[PDB]
Amino acid sequence: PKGVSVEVAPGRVKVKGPKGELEVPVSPEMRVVVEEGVVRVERPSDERRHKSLHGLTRTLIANAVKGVSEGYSKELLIKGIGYRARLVGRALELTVGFSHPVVVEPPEGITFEVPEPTRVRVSGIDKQKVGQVAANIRAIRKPSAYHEKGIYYAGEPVRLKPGKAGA
Amino acid sequence: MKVRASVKRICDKCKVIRRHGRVYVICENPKHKQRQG
Amino acid sequence: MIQPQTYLEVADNTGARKIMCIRVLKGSNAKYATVGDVIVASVKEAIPRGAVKEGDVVKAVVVRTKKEIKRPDGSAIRFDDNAAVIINNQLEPRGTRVFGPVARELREKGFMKIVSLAPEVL
Amino acid sequence: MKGILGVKVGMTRIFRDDRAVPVTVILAGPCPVVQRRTPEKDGYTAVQLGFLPQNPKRVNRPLKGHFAKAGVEPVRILREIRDFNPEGDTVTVEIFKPGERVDVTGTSKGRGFAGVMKRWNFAGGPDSHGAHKIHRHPGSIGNRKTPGRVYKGKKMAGHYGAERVTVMNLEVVDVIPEENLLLVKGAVPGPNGGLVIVRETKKAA
RNA sequence: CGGAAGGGAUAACCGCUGAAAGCAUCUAAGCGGGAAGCCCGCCCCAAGAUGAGGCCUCCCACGGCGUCAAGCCGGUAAGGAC
RNA sequence: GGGGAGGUUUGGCACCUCGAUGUCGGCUCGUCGCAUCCUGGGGCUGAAGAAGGUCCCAAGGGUUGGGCUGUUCGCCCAUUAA
RNA sequence: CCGAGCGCGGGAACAACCGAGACCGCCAGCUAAGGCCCCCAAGUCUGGGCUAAGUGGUAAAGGAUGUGGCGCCGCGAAGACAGCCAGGAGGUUGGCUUAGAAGCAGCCAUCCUUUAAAGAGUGCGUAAUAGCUCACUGGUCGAGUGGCGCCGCGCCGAAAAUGA
């Protein structure tokens, strides 16, 4: 872990890196601290809630690091028809079946990108805000249903017979 | 088939979980949705 | 001021001359009626030689109040009775010959075919 | 935020556009700013407004003549408006420009003894048929043995009349500076010289 | 003329990161959203809220006993009651 | 086939009440319980969109007149968000 | 037992659920029921586990990767489990019926073969084929893993009419 700048604080491990500055509020119940190339991760016993927080801790903090390690791959695509999506101004302007344009303004921890108005990408740093806000995009529009129209991060459509079924 | 005091699995997509309270039954086809009521 | 008994009249050619309002086909517990409401009146009397016959439930467009309806333009207008025409179960009146004037009350309801036939407007 | 004092004059159905509209004129009158109020030294958001001056002899006492700017005492007191704070000048009418809705608090005609049929709304009884004993009365009250109590807050017979109430949303039509008459929609209780004031309405969003 | 509007948490429920268990998982640590509903926001009552709270100002010793203790006693002040 | 829940209906017990507890249905005045008719909502579909079938959460409100019904189960027309 | 003890102490309040025959006085200590967080008198006593719902404030038939402890069996450092590349075959489309029925709608039903390895085939799929598949097996890989029987506590099953 080269370009890292480590720090271990109480219930929250502070880390800095090339992209952004962040921490992950883990737990002051097992002990971790700055060393070598990485950081030692140890639990003080073999409880089950322990090991839960073991894989948890390990991940959590690694997820903090994945952002600084240039993990700004926040992916979006929109399989449909009249699903224009523009990088106008700085932010989201898109129609996905609705008549009224959908506008979305970016919070801190992300930067914007729209290549061709049929697929969109955000470039930011927080696995929380990644999936929370991106599934909030999948909430901007419900997928497939019978055939295929709407927003899928990269998901898939399953067919449910349209030419009959409802009778 | 939501909500009933007994809850079971048919296929290997079907499973059981605890969250915010009682028992919950899932599957790939969410047509197999239940609860323990 | 009409209710499920208010004996009322017609000014048409078609057949009936008198009916009896049943409902108002609106807010179902309103019942009160001025120039605009919709009475599903039960037919009471008609002309012994023609179509449409005594005692068939019919829907109905309403005109002519006996207590003047409060006009927007300051004024107030009413006729010499309490009356109007039928609406049929596929919209519009089953009529074709008006007797005497109307009001722009009806015009504000947006039913012109009646108003083009209307000789005098108030 | 905004507001002004006022007395009810008129109600007529003037012809704006081509229309009969209920117009209450409100002589807001000379309402001088006096005791300003703030949370720290007092409690809440308020300023004091004196409806109209006519008391030299028949009033006496501190006079907000001491306040900082004299201005004497009105024919009837200055009042602390909920939500309002100006600059230092006399508010009257022109602060309200043509085309806005406002809240309006009235004190209104009392009545005294009031019955149910014109307090709530019940069914009196037979003007024939049954007993002529009851004629006009509410009928039953509570249940038998259980519960058995006449419920607390119940609708009963007593007083209805002079109440202090704020009405919601009425367009300001016009405004007169020279004598001081605000012209708005049609309502306002109280006598044709009773007590009523304007607040800033809580509109859409 | 008005119900709403808006906020805050939340249910049934929709999701993120997430292990225990190299797989999973909305949950075990935390986050998002979510009802005409809960509280406020909104209109009324409201300081016997024996908590009588807060504020502008007005008036003003002993004027007479109670030598200490608490009051008492009349003309007044500012005012008020008839 | 099992077991449970709720105490609106019809029964069992006769235990207060036979040292006067005066009755169905109708008018009147409400208040509540939610196993919820309608409006909110969500998942499911043997759910194309329009509509429907099911379960769960969700009372803040709303729920018409009428003729033969005296009337216990009426019936129908006319409505209605019901 | 009460009635004849609705005399006394508990049970919150409740003649018979427990303790106790009251002759009267007592500012005398013992003591039964139950009690020590309190009103109410008495240990926030001393100690080792168990529970995470307010279980305890009181419900079931039945249902569950809620947790600790006992114990049974194998895969496995020759390397398990789990995720990956790879076959995952052929007579066989088994027989048969059947419009056709190909492992797969179904009924009758057991052979062996190229083998490291493929089941007269596990679910899905087609009109029936085709097809995703998994069991099988080798590796990659690194230290445990999956199932059964048992004893405790909690979980749901759990919706009413004044306000708790």
Curated annotation (Swiss-Prot), chain A:
It comes from the Bacteria. GO terms for cellular component: cytosolic large ribosomal subunit. Keywords: Ribonucleoprotein, Ribosomal protein, RNA-binding, rRNA-binding. SUPFAM superfamilies: Ribosomal protein L6. The keyword Disulfide bond does not apply. One of its GO terms (molecular function) is rRNA binding. One of its GO terms (biological process) is cytoplasmic translation. This protein binds to the 23S rRNA, and is important in its secondary structure. It is located near the subunit interface in the base of the L7/L12 stalk, and near the tRNA binding site of the peptidyltransferase center. Part of the 50S ribosomal subunit. Belongs to the universal ribosomal protein uL6 family. This is Large ribosomal subunit protein uL6.
Curated annotation (Swiss-Prot), chain B:
Belongs to the bacterial ribosomal protein bL36 family. It comes from Thermus thermophilus (strain ATCC BAA-163 / DSM 7039 / HB27). GO terms for molecular function: structural constituent of ribosome. The gene is rpmJ. It comes from the Bacteria. One of its GO terms (cellular component) is ribonucleoprotein complex. GO terms for biological process: translation. Keywords: Ribonucleoprotein, Ribosomal protein. This is Large ribosomal subunit protein bL36. InterPro entries: Ribosomal_bL36, Ribosomal_bL36_sp.
Swiss-Prot record, chain D:
One of its GO terms (cellular component) is cytosolic large ribosomal subunit. Keywords: Ribonucleoprotein, Ribosomal protein, RNA-binding, rRNA-binding. One of its GO terms (molecular function) is structural constituent of ribosome. The keyword DNA repair does not apply. Pfam families: Ribosomal_L3. One of its GO terms (biological process) is translation. It comes from the Bacteria. The keyword Ribonucleoprotein applies. InterPro entries: Ribosomal_uL3, Ribosomal_uL3_bac/org-type, Ribosomal_uL3_CS, Transl_B-barrel_sf. One of the primary rRNA binding proteins, it binds directly near the 3'-end of the 23S rRNA, where it nucleates assembly of the 50S subunit. Part of the 50S ribosomal subunit. Forms a cluster with proteins L14 and L19. Belongs to the universal ribosomal protein uL3 family. This is Large ribosomal subunit protein uL3. It comes from Thermus thermophilus (strain ATCC BAA-163 / DSM 7039 / HB27).
